[PDB]
Every structure is written in C-alpha cells, then in structure tokens.
Amino acid sequence: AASAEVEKLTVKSVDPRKTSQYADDYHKKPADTKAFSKTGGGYWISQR
C-alpha cells in the first residue's frame, strides 16, 4: 500500500466519526486551496 495512504489511515484512526457525513467529507484545510494561476492545461497555445 502507499505509505502516504497508510499514514492518512492512521491519522483517521483518531477521529471518532461523531460528526455528520456532510462536515466529515466537505471539511477543508486552509492549505487545500491553491491560488489561481495559468496552469499547463491548455495555456501553452495562447502563450506563443
């Protein structure tokens, strides 16, 4: 198994799941949102 996934599982071992599905799933850490930028999706076309 992936080491990071195993680490995430042992992290979730401590949470009691005493909250609702909504909060437990839609929770976000402040570092989860990346600032907006021109990614390499389809932007190499217009940057010629």
């Binding site: 198994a1 996934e5 195993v6 599982l9």
Partner: protein, 44 residues
C-alpha cells in the same frame, strides 16, 4: 446451616446487549500482526 424459621425456603439488563460499545470486555484487540493489516489495507 439453616435456621428452621428465619431462612427463606424455595429455589432462588438488556442495555448491556443493546449498546455493547460501552462494554469493556467486548472490544477490539487493537494490536495486530503487521502482515495481516498490510493485507487488509489493500483488501478491504
């Protein structure tokens, strides 16, 4: 060992079966073989 007069003659909960999370005896062992859990993490 019976006093013929004072002795009482003749032959003499469900929460525990309902909410077993509180029961201290019925629990997970909480320590398992590493090989077993490494199989389980990919299996389940």
């Amino acid at each position: 060992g019976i006093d013929p007069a004072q002795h009482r003659f003749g032959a003499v909960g469900v929460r525990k079966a309902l909410q077993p999370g509180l029961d201290p005896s019925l629990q997970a062992p909480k320590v398992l073989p590493k090989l077993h859990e490494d199989f389980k993490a990919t299996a389940t």
